[PDB]
Amino acid sequence: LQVKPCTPEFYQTHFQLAYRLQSRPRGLALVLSNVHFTGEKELEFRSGGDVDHSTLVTLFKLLGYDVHVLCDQTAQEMQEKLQNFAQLPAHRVTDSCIVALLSHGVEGAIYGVDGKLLQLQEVFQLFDNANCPSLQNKPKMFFIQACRGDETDRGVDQQ
Amino acid sequence: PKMRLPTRSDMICGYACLKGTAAMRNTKRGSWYIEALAQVFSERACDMHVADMLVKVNALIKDREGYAPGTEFHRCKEMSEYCSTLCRHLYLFPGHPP
């Protein structure tokens, strides 16, 4: 995996209409991956989740982010550590933030390894303008790899 | 009388699947969404903004189908989406300055 660099010319012609994004590191990134469960047991081992985790850690590092990692956390641990992450002092001197959550989930919430849920609205709130002033006006990216229900899309034939 | 902010703004959230549905993961290649995200971001962050890269990820996901004969997942589908309160283009400007 390699990240092609942007050219000086591209930066000069695009930086004016884009979010400020030149800090080094570009921002902190958190990759939280839950792969091993069993609490309500309907939470099966996420085979392949290890590849996802390694791929994102490598990607975000190559994109210039300082990556933090959390593995197999309970819902309470996720809430507490996400809050700790949102409150880190580095956010004042960086220009953006990345949070990737990978686990089982339901619509609007993700599972901890204990089979308990953490509502995504509570997660976004930790990074909002009131709770995370250090990231005010800065772009905050979230990537959520988790089910949002149990319906499997069967697909439809193209007409 | 100073400019103030809404309580929440400047966020972009990419979801691997749509409300009510399951997100797909390959036992060897990992999640379809993460695999696509890494392919697009690695190759295009240099000249495409994040919301547009998520559109390219959407295209990849729309075109993929499940492989799992004998189960409800064979030829199954999924669709990713992203929601955005961004107020400007989000370019990551990788490798600049050198």
């Binding site: 099966e44 996420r46 085979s47 686990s103 089982h104 989930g105 790899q145 988790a146 089910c147 149990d150 499997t152 | 691997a16 699947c17 399951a22 997100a23 797909m24 993961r25 390959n26 036992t27 999640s31 379809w32 499940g66 492989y67 799992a68 997942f73 199954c76």
Partner: peptide
């Protein structure tokens, strides 16, 4: 093989 999250 593909499975769901």
């Amino acid at each position: 093989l593909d499975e769901s999250x």
